[PDB]
Amino acid sequence: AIIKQMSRYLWPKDSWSDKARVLLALSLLVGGKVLNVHVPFYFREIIDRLNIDVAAVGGTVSAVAGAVIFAYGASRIGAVVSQELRNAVFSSVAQKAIRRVATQTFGHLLNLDLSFHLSKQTGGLTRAIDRGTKGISYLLTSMVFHIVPTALEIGMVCGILTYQFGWEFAAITAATMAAYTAFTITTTAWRTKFRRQANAADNAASTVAVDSLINYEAVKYFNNEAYEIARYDKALQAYERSSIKVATSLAFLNSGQNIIFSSALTLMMWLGARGVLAGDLSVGDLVLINQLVFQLSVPLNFLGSVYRELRQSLLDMETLFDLQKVNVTIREAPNAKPLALPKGGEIRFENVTFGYYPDRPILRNLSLTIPAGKKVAVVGPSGCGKSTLLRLLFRSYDPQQGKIFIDDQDIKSVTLESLRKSIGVVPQDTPLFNDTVELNIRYGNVNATQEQVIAAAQKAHIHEKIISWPHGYQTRVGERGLMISGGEKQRLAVSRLILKDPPLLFFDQATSALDTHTEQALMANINEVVKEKKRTALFVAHRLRTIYDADLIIVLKEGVVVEQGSHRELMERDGVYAEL
């Protein structure tokens, strides 16, 4: 539809070299088809040059028909070499167009907001990408490999037969192509019913066998061996009764296709003989007619899949080109200002209402002030909604009402890249890229040198543990690697943050780790990396005993700030460590 032009007139036409490769492919397409229809013509030339008074005139091959004997073979070889070079060049063109489409779409997805990414399946987006690019590739590949060469050659052959022999040869060839396509498309739509039935009966027989072998002791406790051999036999028999329909309908397909071409090639042999006996044609022209139409029958193998599979592929591109139209919700403000970094970073929540599912909020007119260069910890019950204090300041969501300020300027005005640069985050659950430990350290600042990586692991106290691993900091870590404990993951995240070196720091639920001792070490280390560097640190933890020592402690009771104090005057509440 419009999707076809959206791809086919945008991605293959971008540069010079790629446009050159497209034109090369198209020239080879037409060149191949021209050589193709020259193979029968040189064949009739050979016939018509040796069909002479042999004993009277012709002396040697290479003087009577050597030129056209060589040109027959050269056109034959060239007509296939041009197809294969056309396919090998347009596969490159297609692959670069899919690479551009996939890399742009993936960049757009990484641009899209957290809200969109949280309402999608884990592999849903990537299978959309992959199926969409297979749809683009299959559609371009079919159009250049199969559909357009075949239509061009039907055009060339009907033109040749109309020029030399009459319109009725082209009428018979076009009616043959129409009948062959109608037959093939229809009956290969019918055959898939049969193939799915046979496949299902195969799985049924297999499952009978599996289920009877798993429950083997029950089979022989109840003496039912003959019963299960009978059930397997019956399921296998119901499988062969559907494999018969698959094979018989394939016989119908193939034999009907060749009945259509053989009826054409005989009718046009009768019509060519009728014109040989009238003096119009020569017996070489019978070979011309026969071989032109036969060569039409050769490239037609693609016709089985095409009408299902292009339709599927068109759907697969539709999904992908709908993904490119999802809008980002958090918008960078026009004429945004990267600012307030040298200013003493203070955070000012004012009257902020925020809530997922906006009818039911979490923060109710919240207002608070984080002083510059200090250490502030907010406290509340687990699930009070303190966990959004991240997402609202880092601007992965927006405040529905109220405003967020850094140094008396709204984050909704500051440049979004500049904003996200300023804050570093220790998340609750540290994610692991399936890569080295070294790269997971590096990911804080990807341009950092190896000595910077080791220094960061030193400052967050990991380097002895990565030495203790077998391969060193080159250890393969992740879901499919060397498993590491939650404490080592948290230290890993701390090292990421240190290597980033941001002015603003969050430590959201770093104390979600089970061990109290490991979190004691973790809190200690994050204190020494906070201290003396004016690193404005916010700690969001569910255990105030872990962070009773903060400069300022702000409590939150269901969307409102209640009081602010020290360890003792706020330990008077519940949740005490008397049971810890």
Next chain:
Amino acid sequence: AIIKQMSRYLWPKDSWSDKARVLLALSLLVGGKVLNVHVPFYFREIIDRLNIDVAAVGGTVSAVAGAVIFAYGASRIGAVVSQELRNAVFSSVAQKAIRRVATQTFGHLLNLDLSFHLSKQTGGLTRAIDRGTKGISYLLTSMVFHIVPTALEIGMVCGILTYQFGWEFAAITAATMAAYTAFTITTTAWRTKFRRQANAADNAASTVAVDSLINYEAVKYFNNEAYEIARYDKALQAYERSSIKVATSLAFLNSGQNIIFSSALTLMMWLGARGVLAGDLSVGDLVLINQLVFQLSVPLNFLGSVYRELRQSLLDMETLFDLQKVNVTIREAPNAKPLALPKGGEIRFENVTFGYYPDRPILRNLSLTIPAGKKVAVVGPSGCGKSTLLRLLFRSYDPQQGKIFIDDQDIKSVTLESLRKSIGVVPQDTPLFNDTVELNIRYGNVNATQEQVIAAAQKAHIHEKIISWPHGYQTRVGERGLMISGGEKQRLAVSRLILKDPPLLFFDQATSALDTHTEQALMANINEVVKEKKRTALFVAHRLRTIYDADLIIVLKEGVVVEQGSHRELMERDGVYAEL
């Protein structure tokens, strides 16, 4: 090898009708190839009958060449209809041979002993069956569909060209077939390196995308969107650099194949023209030569896969035909006697030593006597090895030393079917066939009527629960069905046993269920079904409090019987219900 004759001279040749279908297929094979090589011959006849002094002699088609114009089309249509009927008939022959092989092998597997079945993977045996039958099917299918018709047609065509034109035409055709096969086999072995590389690079690019989209919040916390778009772009570029090698090597394959046939068809056109200019041949014979050898080039599509895939298939049959050679270890005694059922069924262990992994035994010279028509429960710690008291009496294993007696006759002499008929078993874990609740009841005695099934569910007190299910006793139950609790499964097994109605009963670890109340009901019900019917019952339970009420209690302390008594005089040991 010998495997080929083991299949090909045993399974397709068993009955009359199947032998008829084999001969029909083979006749169609040869018939098709004869018609095939008659298509070019009638084509030259057409040429050579219209190549006359047209203005002087020939008057109408249908009198000059109508017969051979029709015979050309009839041979054309018939030569493909015979292929398709040959394929559709031999697919039936092959499928029945695979059905016989698979059903016999599965019957043999159910014959094999528990020891063999316990040392195999759950799906290992069935994937051996399935892959072996696909190997048989592919080998028979290739040999009748592709390899033998092509060899026959090469033989026919080289015979025809040697007869009419000379040995050098057959030498060129055989050298073309050899060169085409050598080229195709070699280069399609090389192409698979490229295909696997490209497939791996595709998966690498996909995994880069998946891993970057999963860890999305970490992507935008650390501002690394451009980094991940660059990584995806680089992985996609490394994919297209291998897709180029796949497509270019496919171009090499296809264009080389057609270079070989086009060199043949031009060389033999030169040699046919050399013989037309000498008067030997006519210009129809050029079309005969050309079309015979071209038609040789048509069925050669199979040559890509054949040398890898037949080798794989041959391995797949080897595994299967090795499975048919595993020996059963527990042997039925020659001249065995079905006996000792009306005799009061008493069990006599004498001096029995038994052990898995024979160096380390479990039962050490065990000897015990179960009185006829009574109720006996053996007791011991969990893992003392009482759980083999089943497998030794039911004769799924054999006593390495010592002897087992039922009514003063050795089980190793009694007919194995007669032995396994006598004992009914309530297993520790009740297995569930993925079928109805009704069939799981029925499986105790598969010839029982529905009223028998309902009566058995009544006697073991399930019928209210199967009424309470939505669809009734037709409820779909199992791993992929309506989940049922362990107590209902145990009642289900009890009902199986009741429907079997055996003289001998075991209840091995029926008390493995968690609930004490459900097992109280279960013990109650199995008591009423034991009582008054002289059902010799052995209860193997780890909690003697459940079965303190037995007529006889035999204790087992690590492979030896220690004492025999009542509830109180044996409750003096440990494991008391004082902590229950």
